[PDB]
Design a protein around this ligand. Structure first.
Ligand SMILES: CN(CC#Cc1nc2c(N)ncnc2n1[C@@H]1O[C@H](CNC(=O)Nc2ccccc2)[C@@H](O)[C@H]1O)C[C@H]1O[C@@H](n2cnc3c(N)ncnc32)[C@H](O)[C@@H]1O
Ligand SMILES: CN(CC#Cc1nc2c(N)ncnc2n1[C@@H]1O[C@H](CNC(=O)Nc2ccccc2)[C@@H](O)[C@H]1O)C[C@H]1O[C@@H](n2cnc3c(N)ncnc32)[C@H](O)[C@@H]1O
Ligand SMILES: CN(CC#Cc1nc2c(N)ncnc2n1[C@@H]1O[C@H](CNC(=O)Nc2ccccc2)[C@@H](O)[C@H]1O)C[C@H]1O[C@@H](n2cnc3c(N)ncnc32)[C@H](O)[C@@H]1O
Ligand SMILES: CN(CC#Cc1nc2c(N)ncnc2n1[C@@H]1O[C@H](CNC(=O)Nc2ccccc2)[C@@H](O)[C@H]1O)C[C@H]1O[C@@H](n2cnc3c(N)ncnc32)[C@H](O)[C@@H]1O
Lengths: 259, 259, 259, 259
């Protein structure tokens, strides 16, 4: 079945890529990097992120797999040594799909939308960052700090985690807002805690004075000018993973942070 | 319809209780404190917690209402002044039910189960608190600290919040584990972050040496002796609230912590 | 005695400035904004910061006073209403000096030094921020995160505080390092806690790959290119405040954050 | 010179103790466990703490040494293998003393004082912990939470650290107050940050309703009844360490938490 493979582009990963394509040739898997059904990423979670964004308009039609040739990532949860086995099962099919939820960011000025697999962050360009925070059309706080991070479930082990966010199991359809260094006094008062929103809640940010912001989607950082609204909601689209064995998420969490 | 009313027992709340019963008499609402269908709590969230536990084996059959005669609580979200209106709508019916998820704690030695509306905490009796933490039969960390807090969604604004937990919207069926003062070194290593578990995940705690613990369920604190396991999971039972108007949770969060 | 007065430049503060100069004329206080002995700042702590930096090469020879025409600052701890009294005592002299410690930042490429009254921060320009941290020539950690904040004692109620830093009483001659969003895994491991250094300790930062950084001294933000070292130490210079009455620091802390 | 040696009392440490005494016999060091001049502790920091408290009325007259037969402690910073060298230099003298500051806790009801090397903590007995906090006779906050920890400089790597306290270099004469799980709302408002006090500041705690508390001094936990005041200040007494080589504190910090 159609397939494509992306590489971190160092020596170790380019080699492993050519050996996989050859093994795929020993079945009749048609390489197509235009309409693949299976997208294999080789290197690190960053490489995987790029694989996801390279194909984010065909999400409902692709199964992604991560192979970490550096250290384990959360998306790249295959060692190189397991490559030949991968190719094998990947050919026979009879594999299962798991879907993780995604984050839609909408930026009104026209109107542009982004899909994040880790998180969408907002900071200020130059001046201090001051936005009013609106939850389902309800004014909640006036945030003054360094910025805000909206994380997916699988993104909570990433940036979110470093911001003191909670770690969330990916089957939960939600989004998590973490503060970045809010000032807090009788004047300026924010909630502090990470907030965790369900499906269909719209978290909307509204600027007070400066209208320019730096928006980051999975480490891509766009500068946006003359901003009127940023809207976060849990996306309707989901990413699909090819699952060949049990690698529970909490097991994955353990190996990356405890031992 | 059958009903009962609980009081904080200070002067302000006992009065408001008698005036509500009289107004109920002006309809024909039968007071029954043995099999009520509607349980009204008057005072603070503590009073409400007690109302919930007084009737925790008939949860599937009761709608609770909170009236705060002190400061707003999260469960007691009615001012006294609105009492006469309450009685009124409470009589005609045609009100809606909202259900919040609950937490089951199971303590094996026989075996005892508890239902929490805020959270179930564990501390040590005397000695240091050391348990191994097991997630769906997966050894995750060996925790050494002051203790652990497992919070419901609606409990995340309570103890959980003070432990740096995330605030969670109550429609989300989950449970949140917050650490209490873990020691962290090359020897002892815990995750740090609040962890947030879905339905059907069982978080199980297993003692290393000392076997005695102080377990707290909604501020009730039992000492347990010769403990073999503590098991947390999202309960199948839910609590039901009578809803007469919109008081969104995030609105409720705003009023209690921001302004 | 020679004196000068700086203004936030809104209407309220310019007026108060002219009325003070007139009152000074009713004594014979020579206005000199080139070699003042007394520097009065009118507006907010920001205005005061600017007053300090406008005269940072004559620190050993100036007493600063803050008047807050907005909300109380930590440096601007005089209400406008007290202005006429201020002028009065300011004329007779017989006032006491308090000195707060300062922070020297040294940036080697030539070599440039900065004096901070609040803090010196470092972030990355574009890429991720990765420096090795060296304490008295001892390699301590390899920090990978958003950045680092080195705060003075009186600066600990400022940025430092929002970064989870400790609040420090200003008579203590020290400097405090707070992390900004470190990544932590088996690979990358930082201390986490705020660190608090004494006099004569040199905290030195050393870049790993990217050599460009954004350095902030009291909210002035310079971009520095081809950086070889950043060195923090407690400065030998001190700032002097004119003290006319008791306004203890902890009292000051209480009014700004508790009530 | 007079000397004594304390043991964790497991097999490894009792042996090492007898071999040191024999080596001391090969000089003429008089063993005296009543008036030693040198107190050697063998095991872990806990063992060392006990050695300190066993001799806390002769502090101005004893040099302590720690040997860790488990893992390195902060006070037990000698490996067993270095024992014979220790004995040697310990005999010739010509060693240097370093002194770390200590914490005095005063508990008025009569009046009892305690000396801590790590920290003095306060919790409640049964009920919720509510004290007013007074700094040099200035009412600062009304704390409602799980408790409070007052840490020495060298204690900041201990409990203090787990409470989010800052790590402090021991030459700094100060004390650090960390909160334990304060509730924070418009009603109850505490500072949050660790506070760091200098010499001569008296931090005094005053109970609101319940008067019983559990006070912990270096993990000794006394229950105190009918309490009127707890007073913390930096002690006039200091502990003295025998220093035979450079083991800088920050180096010590690195080895225990980073690598
Ligand atoms: C360039 N990245 C690729 C990714 C990813 C990533 N996904 C996840 C995930 N789902 N769950 C768990 N771990 C993850 N990883 C891991 O992170 C390290 C890779 N990347 C960073 O090292 N980046 C970085 C950025 C700035 C400062 C310091 C570090 C590896 O171990 C990966 O496996 C982008 C991602 O960087 C995160 N990010 C941004 N700022 C961060 C910060 N201050 N602290 C921690 N993370 C931060 C964020 O999520 C962004 O999308
Ligand atoms: C006796 N309580 C009754 C309750 C509740 C309660 N529910 C919630 C909730 N769903 N969401 C938001 N707020 C809540 N409230 C609010 O809390 C204050 C009432 N109670 C406390 O003041 N108790 C306390 C206990 C120890 C130390 C300091 C304070 C009011 O404002 C209520 O409206 C029991 C609950 O106490 C929580 N608890 C325990 N230790 C805590 C700590 N260290 N910090 C913060 N909370 C702590 C916990 O959830 C326990 O079940
Ligand atoms: C432009 N400032 C002037 C100052 C100062 C200042 N000194 C102190 C101090 N000794 N002790 C206590 N409070 C202080 N203030 C108070 O701070 C508010 C003023 N300024 C900010 O609002 N600035 C800001 C910046 C970015 C994002 C949000 C807020 C008033 O109330 C002042 O009285 C510069 C100072 O901004 C601090 N800063 C930077 N980033 C921060 C952040 N994320 N959170 C909190 N502070 C941050 C930092 O110290 C910088 O030097
Ligand atoms: C019985 N101890 C002896 C001691 C000490 C000690 N001194 C220091 C120090 N100057 N600097 C750095 N590390 C230190 N150590 C290290 O701590 C571990 C030993 N002890 C604990 O494991 N005790 C414990 C208690 C409750 C829950 C979990 C752990 C070793 O590695 C030692 O080398 C008493 C000390 O226990 C601290 N303590 C209390 N509660 C704590 C908590 N929740 N988290 C972290 N520490 C906590 C506190 O300072 C008390 O005095």
């Amino acid at each position: 079945m159609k397939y494509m493979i992306t590489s971190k582009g160092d020596e170790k990963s380019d080699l492993l890529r050519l050996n996989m394509i050859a093994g795929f040739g020993e079945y009749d898997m048609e390489y197509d990097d235009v309409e693949p059904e299976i997208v294999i990423s080789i290197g690190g979670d960053g490489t995987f992120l790029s694989a996801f964004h390279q194909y984010e308009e065909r999400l409902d039609e692709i199964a992604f797999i991560g192979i970490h040739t550096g250290h384990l990532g959360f998306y790249a949860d295959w060692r190189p040594a397991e490559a030949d086995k991968l190719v094998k099962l990947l050919a026979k099919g009879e594999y299962q799909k798991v879907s993780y939820p995604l984050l839609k960011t909408t930026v009104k000025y026209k109107e542009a939308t982004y899909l994040a697999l880790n998180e969408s962050t907002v900071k200020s360009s130059g001046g201090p960052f001051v936005v009013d925070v609106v939850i389902n059309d309800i004014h909640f706080e006036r945030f003054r700090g360094d910025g805000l991070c909206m994380s997916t479930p699988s993104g909570t082990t990433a940036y979110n985690k470093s911001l003191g966010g909670a770690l969330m199991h990916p089957s939960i359809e939600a989004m998590q807002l973490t503060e970045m260094a809010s000032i807090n006094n009788r004047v300026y008062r924010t909630i502090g805690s990470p907030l965790v929103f369900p499906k269909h809640h719209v978290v909307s940010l509204q600027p007070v004075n400066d209208k320019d912001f730096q928006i980051s989607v999975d480490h891509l950082s766009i500068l946006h000018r003359d901003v009127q609204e940023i809207r976060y909601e849990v996306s309707a689209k989901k990413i699909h993973f090819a699952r060949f064995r049990s690698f529970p998420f909490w097991r994955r969490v353990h190996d990356s942070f405890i031992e």
